[PDB]
C-alpha cells in the first residue's frame, strides 16, 4: 500500500476496522494471510476472544469462617510491594477482595463490564453430618460491600440454592446481573458509608454458609457476560518472579490454589 | 520502468486517499521494488539508459552457456561422491561400513555456497551405495535410513549396532555384489522441524547406514571400497537471512 | 481487536553524527515486549498490552506489524533503512564497530526523509515451529536461589529461539543532516509494534502476569 | 458459548446388580475384552446337531 | 509367482505393498488366504490394529507425594540391570518417568507421535473428609520435564479438572496434543538445562493433587493419538523371567500393579 | 522412477539396433541422469523407498517458507549498498566521488556464494546514486558509464580525469540535490567476450564514475555522503565448471 | 467400587483356542495354562476386602 | 503392516563338503522368533520385531513367508531343498546322521542354485 | 543338501552363509492381547 508517508497515516482505528493496510516487507501479503493447519494440526482448538477465556473458573479467595459475606461483583485485585533490601521478603500481596482470576485480570483492561457471574466452591472439609451448603443472595442496603463474617441473624425469604459437599463436592452457582443500569464500572470504588445500594455495581452479595471450617471461592463469567472499553495493560507484575527470594528472605506469597488450600 | 523492477507506485496522491485524513499532503514520491529491496523515494527520480539501450541479444553467449539452466534447486539436487569406505574380507556380520548424518554429509562447498542465505530448507534424500567386486567374490551389504539420530533413545541407536535384525527391520535396500551393481534408497524429510535449521544446526533428520550383511566371502584376504552418491530432492528453501549457514 | 491496538514500546535517536552503516536500534520479534515499573525497580517490569494479553497463553505465532515515527521537520534530510534479520539476535546483526552486517541478505526498506514521517511494515512469522513460546523471565540464580530477570535475546541459538523469530533493525544510511541556524541537530525516532491478522495464540493456563492495585516499595 | 442447563432432573435408583436372577434383561457387566461389543456367534450345527439341546423339548 | 530369483526380488516395501506376493509352498494361495470364522466362532473379535491397542489403559507409576508435577508425554522406559552371581537379585530395574505401558511398550518401536493422551489415577486412600483430586495442566517454562514434587505456590488461574475418589473412586483425564509442531519425538531427551520448553514434545505437564498420600497413575492414548515411522523391536527383556530367582536371593522386581499397589 | 530422474533408459538390447552389428550383445544395464550427473550401470538395481512413500508436504513448510521463490538470477538482481563515499565542499569541479569497476564492486561474498561454479556470466547493470542533502544545500553530480575500463586507451581514461566535459558526452545521468533524491543509470552487458571471466577475470566489462559537476555549495565547509546502490538485471549464466571463482 | 455399588460385575469372553469347549476338562500338575480344552484365560481378583463371595 | 517387516533371524552354511541329504538347518514354524542380548547373557533372550508385535497376544495362527538369501556367486552351484514338515521338531525331521528322513511325504522345493 | 556345493577353489571360497528372514503372510492374525511376553527397557547392562 506504501511503506511510508508524509503525515500520520497509520491511525488506532483505521488499522483495527480494517481501513488501513500496512504491507508485509517482503511484498507478498500471503506470507502474513491466516493459515488454519497449525491449529488443526498442533493445538486442537483456536481461541478467538478473551470472551472465551473468561468462562473457565479460577480460584479467587480463601474464606475461614463458616458463614460469610462475600461481594460478588467486586472485581479488585491485590496491592503489591517489592524490595530488594536483605532478609525482606521480595514480594508481598494484600488482597481486598480476593486474588486475580481469568475473570479479574481480563477484566482490569477494561472499564466496563454487564451480564452475570458464576461461583464455585471447594470445601475445607466435607462433613458427612452436616454436608450441606447454601449460597444466598445478599441484599441486606446496610452491609458495605467487602467481605465480612455473617452476624445477621435476621435475613428471612433470601433467594437461596444448596449443595452438598458429600454427594457432590463442589458447589456451583450462577448470578443474575439483576443491576440498576446496563452499563457497570469494574473496579468501582467502594466506600465506608457505601453500604449496598451504589448504582456502579449490581447491588447484590452472596452469604455462604456450610460446616466447613474453610473453603475456597472460584468464579468465571456466565454465559450473558461482557467486558468493555478496552484500556490497555492494567498495572501489572511478573507471577513467576513472585518466587523470588534474593534477599535471604524465603518467598512468603502465595496465591490461592487448590494444592494450596487443600494440604495445610 | 524498464529498471527490471518487481513493482512500482507512484505514491504523490496517497496521503489523499485515506479515509479518516482530510486535505492530506501532496508529496511527490515513489515507491519501488527490485527482489529483496524496496525503494521508499520521498523526491523525484530520473531512470537514464544508453541511447537506443538494447540488452546483450541471447545469440551472443552461446559459445559459452549451457543450453540446460540451472537454479538452487538444480544445484541441491546434482549428485555427490559423499565418500569411499572400507570393507574387507575380516569385517563380520553387522559391521558398520559407514553412517552419514543428513544434511551434514552433503553439505559441500557447492552446497553451501548454494544455502547461504536461507534460513533452513527440507529435502528428500536419495544414496546410492556402489560396490565393484569381480565375478569370484560375494556377499552381501544392507543400506537403511534412521531418523533424527541425535535426539533418538540411545537404546534404539544401541540396538542398530549391535544385531544387523534391527537394522533390517528399517527402511532399507539390500546389496548383493554378485547380482547388482548399485542399489538406491530415497528417504523424504521427516522432522518434528518443519525445515532443518542451517542456523543452529539442531537437529540432522535423519542417517544413512550401510552395514555388513552377509561378510565378502572370497578364497583369500581381500577388501573392497564401498561407495556412496548422494543428492536432495523435493527441495523446500527457508527464508531470506543474514545468517551464517553454520560450519 | 485486542492484539491489534498499538503498543508504544521503544524509541531512538537519529542525528548528524549518524554514520553510513551504524545500527541505531534493534528489537527481538516476538510478543513479550516490556516497559518500565516507575514507582519500583523490579527486573521483570511492565508489560505492554501485548505483552499482558498474549502472556494468558504460552504460544504465539503469527505477523507483527511495527510503526516508525520520525519526529522531524522538512529540514531535516538522510535515509534509513529498516531490516528483518530472521535467525539472528541483536550482537549478531552488528559489527564491533556498532555496523550493521550483511544486509545484502535481507528483506530491506530504505526510506528516504525529507517529508515522510512514517513508515510501516509487517514482519512476517519466519520459524520452524508452528508456535514459538511467550517468554517468561528466567532464573538468574542457581536453584534453590530465585531471581527472575528478563530474558536477553543478544544471540539467536537453543537457549533463546524458542521464543522469538530474529531481529528488526534499523540502520542509518547517511547521517541525518540539517542547518544548525535553524533546526536541532538530533531527532527521536518512536515505535510502537501491534498484531498483524494472522496473529494467533494458543495453551492458555498459568499466566505470564499478574495484575496488581498498586504496587510500591516496601519499607 | 456456555449457557445454563435446561435439561430437567431424573429421578434414578441405585442398584448393585440389576437382572442378577433373570433370564433376560440388559447385563451391565464390565467385559474383559478389548472389545467392547466382543461376542462369538451361534454356531450351528454345534456338537454334532442342528437342534437345539438346552430346549426342555 | 515363481520360488527363486537371479538377484534380489523381496523388497522391503514391494512386499507390504502387495507388489511382490510370494507363492505358497503348497502352490495352492487358498492355503494363506484369509477365513474369517476362527475369530468369529472362537475369539469373538478381531483386532487389527495397534491403534486399538494403545487407548487401553494400563499403569505407569505409583507416587507417594500427595501434591505431584508428572512429565505428561515422557514415554520412556526403565534401565535393566541382569546378573546371574550368586546372592544378588537376578533383575533391576529402574524407573525415570515410569514402568513400561502399552502405549509407552508400542512407542518403542516408533520414532514419532502426535495427538493427545489420557490419564486415569486410582487413590491410594479415598480420604472422605478431603476426597477431592484435582489435576491441572503445568506450564512453567523454569520446571524440567521430569517428576518431581509440588514445591509451586504460585500457579495461578490454571487449567483444571476435578474428580471425587469417594463418588467416583478413580480419576480420568484427557490431555490434548497442545504441541508446537505436528511431529513430537518419541522418548525424546529430556535435559538439566532444558526446562518445559523443548519443541520435541508438548510444552506441557501434570499437577496432580489430592489429599491421598498415594496415587497410582495410568494412560493409554486419546483418540487423536498416532505413531509414526516404524523401526523395529526395542531393546527388551521377557516380563516372565522377572521372577527369575535362581542366584539363591529373592525377585525384588515389582511392576506397578493394582495388586500391587492396593495392598501394602 | 520417481528417483527425480531428468532420463531414463533401459539399454539392455542397445546393441541389438546398431546397423554394422550383427548378433549385438544382449547386456542388462541401465543409464539414467540426475541433474549434470549421468550414471551409466551395468548390472540391475533397485530403488526403494518408505512403504506409501509420501514427500514433506508443502503445506507443512509456511510457517518458514517465503511466498516468494529465490532462484540464483534473483540473488544477483538484488540491490546492494555498495559503498558511500565523501563529497565536501572543498571539492572542485570533477573531483571524483567514485569509480567501481564491474562487475567488481557487486562482487559481495552473497554474489560470489551464488556464481560459483559457473565459467562466467553477462547482464545489464543497475546503478543508484543517492544524497540526501538538507534544502539549504545545493551542488551537482554526474553519475557516468564507461566500458572496459582496464584495456581502454589511456587517452581516454585521462580526458575523464581531466575534464568533466568528457564525462557528460559519457552515457550519464545528473544529480541535482535540491531537486532530484536520487538517480539512476542501466548499462547494458558490453564487450568482446560474450560474458565476464570468473575465472581469470580478464577484463571487467565497465566501470561507473560519479564526478563533481558543481560544487557542494552551503555557507561553511560541509560534507555529504554519496551512496551507491546496485544489481544486476537481464542475467545469462555460462557453464557449469570446478573452476574456483577468483578472489 | 464396594462403596458406590456393592457388587462386583464381570463379562468374560470365549477368547477360545478351538471353537468347542470340553466340560469339566482334566486339569493336571504339568498343565499350566495352555490345553486347548478350555479358554486360556483365568481371573486375577483383588481388593480389600478381606473375604468375598463369587 | 508392522508384522509384514522383514524379520532377519538365521543363518546358517553351505558347501562342497555339505553331503547328500545332510540337514543345513531347521526351525520350528511360530512367531517367538528371538536374538541374543550382546551385552549380557540372560538365557531368554532379545525378541526379533515379530516376537515383540506378537508377544501382546496369546495367540497366533496364520501363514509365515520365509526368504532365504544364499550369499553365493556365479561360479558355485549346487541343489538344495526347503521341506516342511508339519506336526514334528527338529530332532524328528533327522536320522542320528543328521540327514533327512521320509521327504517323500513333505511340501518340498527343490531349488537350482548357479 | 541335495549335493555338495562345488565350486572352483581357485577363485572361490568353498563355503557360503545363507541368510533366513521371516515375516507374517496375509491371513496372519493374533488374538486375546493381555500380559506381554516382552518388557522394553531403555538400557540393559551386567549388574557388578
Known amino acids: ?264 | ?247 | 481487536y485486542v492484539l491489534k491496538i498499538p503498543n508504544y514500546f521503544s524509541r531512538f535517536k537519529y542525528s548528524s553524527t549518524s554514520l553510513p552503516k551504524q545500527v541505531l536500534w534493534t528489537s527481538p520479534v516476538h510478543p513479550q515486549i516490556i516497559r518500565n515499573h516507575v514507582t519500583v525497580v523490579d527486573a521483570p517490569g511492565q508489560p505492554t498490552l501485548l505483552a499482558y494479553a498474549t502472556g494468558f497463553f504460552k504460544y504465539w505465532r503469527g505477523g507483527l506489524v511495527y510503526t516508525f515515527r520520525f519526529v522531524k521537520t522538512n529540514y531535516h534530510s538522510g535515509r534509513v533503512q529498516i531490516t528483518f534479520h530472521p535467525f539472528v539476535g541483536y550482537d549478531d546483526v552488528m559489527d564491533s564497530d556498532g555496523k550493521i552486517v550483511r544486509d545484502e541478505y535481507v528483506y530491506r526498506v530504505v526510506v528516504d526523509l525529507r517529508d515522510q514521517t512514517e513508515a510501516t511494515l509487517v514482519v512476517p512469522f519466519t520459524s520452524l515451529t508452528p508456535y514459538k513460546v511467550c517468554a517468561d523471565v528466567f532464573n538468574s540464580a542457581n536453584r534453590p536461589k530465585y531471581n527472575y530477570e528478563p530474558r536477553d535475546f543478544k544471540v539467536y541459538d537453543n537457549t533463546t529461539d524458542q521464543f522469538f523469530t530474529g531481529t528488526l533493525c534499523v540502520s542509518a544510511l547517511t547521517p541525518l543532516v540539517s542547518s544548525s541556524a535553524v533546526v536541532s541537530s538530533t531527532i527521536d525516532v518512536l515505535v510502537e509494534v501491534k498484531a498483524s491478522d494472522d496473529f494467533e495464540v494458543a495453551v492458555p493456563n498459568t499466566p505470564l502476569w499478574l495484575p496488581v492495585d498498586s504496587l510500591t516499595e516496601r519499607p | 458459548s456456555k449457557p445454563l442447563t435446561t435439561i430437567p432432573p431424573t429421578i434414578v435408583v441405585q442398584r448393585p446388580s440389576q437382572y442378577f436372577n433373570n433370564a433376560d434383561g440388559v447385563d451391565q457387566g464390565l467385559p474383559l475384552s478389548l472389545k467392547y461389543g466382543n461376542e462369538v456367534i451361534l454356531k450351528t450345527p454345534f456338537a454334532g446337531t442342528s437342534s437345539d439341546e438346552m430346549a426342555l423339548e
Request: hydrophobic share 40%; charged share 15%.
Open chain 2, 1 to 247: 520502468k524498464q529498471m527490471n523492477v518487481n513493482s512500482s507506485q507512484d505514491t504523490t496522491f496517497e496521503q489523499r486517499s485515506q479515509e479518516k485524513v482530510q486535505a492530506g499532503e501532496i508529496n511527490e514520491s515513489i515507491e519501488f521494488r527490485n527482489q529483496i529491496t524496496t525503494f521508499v523515494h520521498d523526491n523525484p527520480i530520473i531512470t537514464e539508459q544508453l541511447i537506443g539501450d538494447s540488452p546483450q541479444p541471447s545469440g551472443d553467449v552461446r559459445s559459452v552457456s549451457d543450453a540446460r539452466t540451472h537454479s538452487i534447486i538444480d544445484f541441491l539436487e546434482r549428485p555427490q561422491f559423499i565418500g569411499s569406505f572400507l570393507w574387507n574380507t575380516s569385517d563380520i556380520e553387522n559391521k558398520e561400513i559407514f553412517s552419514l548424518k543428513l544434511p551434514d554429509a552433503l553439505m559441500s562447498p557447492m552446497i553451501r555456497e548454494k544455502l547461504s542465505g536461507f534460513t533452513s530448507f527440507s529435502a528428500s534424500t536419495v544414496f546410492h551405495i556402489q560396490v565393484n567386486a569381480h565375478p569370484f567374490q560375494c556377499g552381501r551389504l544392507v543400506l537403511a535410513a534412521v531418523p533424527v539420530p541425535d535426539i533418538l533413545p540411545l537404546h534404539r541407536l544401541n540396538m542398530l549396532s549391535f544385531d544387523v535384525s534391527n537394522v533390517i527391520t528399517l527402511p532399507h535396500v539390500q546389496l548383493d555384489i554378485s547380482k547388482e551393481t548399485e542399489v538406491l534408497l530415497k528417504i523424504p524429510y521427516v522432522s518434528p522441524f518443519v525445515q532443518y535449521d542451517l542456523v543452529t544446526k539442531f537437529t540432522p533428520w535423519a542417517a544413512f547406514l550401510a552395514h555388513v550383511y552377509a561378510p565378502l566371502n572370497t578364497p583369500s584376504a581381500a577388501s573392497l571400497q564401498v561407495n556412496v552418491f548422494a543428492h536432495f530432492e523435493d527441495i523446500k528453501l527457508g527464508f531470506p537471512t543474514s545468517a551464517i549457514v553454520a560450519q
Open chain 1, 1 to 264: 500500500v506504501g511503506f511510508a508517508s508524509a503525515g500520520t497515516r497509520d491511525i488506532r482505528s483505521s488499522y483495527v476496522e480494517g481501513k488501513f493496510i500496512p504491507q508485509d516487507i517482503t511484498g507478498m501479503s500471503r506470507n502474513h494471510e491466516l493459515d488454519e493447519q497449525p491449529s488443526q494440526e498442533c493445538i486442537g482448538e483456536r481461541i478467538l476472544s478473551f470472551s472465551e477465556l473468561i468462562k473457565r473458573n479460577s480460584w479467587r479467595y480463601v474464606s475461614d469462617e463458616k458463614s460469610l459475606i462475600y461481594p460478588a461483583y467486586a472485581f479488585d485485585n491485590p496491592a503489591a510491594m517489592y524490595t530488594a533490601a536483605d532478609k525482606l521478603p521480595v514480594w508481598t500481596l494484600t488482597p481486598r477482595s480476593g486474588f486475580p482470576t481469568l475473570l479479574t485480570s481480563i477484566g482490569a483492561m477494561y472499564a466496563f463490564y454487564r451480564g452475570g457471574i458464576r461461583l464455585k466452591i471447594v470445601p475445607g472439609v466435607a462433613d458427612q453430618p452436616k454436608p450441606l451448603v447454601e449460597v444466598a443472595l445478599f441484599t441486606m442496603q446496610d452491609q458495605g460491600y467487602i467481605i465480612k463474617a455473617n452476624d445477621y441473624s435476621t435475613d428471612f425469604c433470601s433467594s437461596n440454592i444448596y449443595e452438598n459437599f458429600v454427594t457432590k463436592g463442589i458447589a456451583e452457582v450462577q448470578t443474575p446481573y439483576y443491576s440498576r443500569v446496563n452499563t457497570s464500572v469494574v473496579s468501582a470504588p467502594v466506600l465506608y458509608n457505601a453500604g449496598n445500594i451504589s448504582p456502579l455495581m449490581p447491588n447484590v452479595m452472596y452469604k455462604i454458609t456450610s460446616n466447613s471450617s474453610n473453603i475456597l471461592l472460584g468464579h468465571s463469567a456466565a454465559d450473558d457476560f461482557r467486558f468493555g472499553f478496552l484500556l490497555g495493560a492494567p498495572l501489572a507484575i511478573s507471577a513467576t518472579a513472585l518466587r523470588d527470594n534474593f534477599t535471604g528472605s524465603s518467598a512468603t506469597v502465595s496465591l490461592p490454589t487448590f494444592s494450596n488450600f487443600y494440604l495445610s
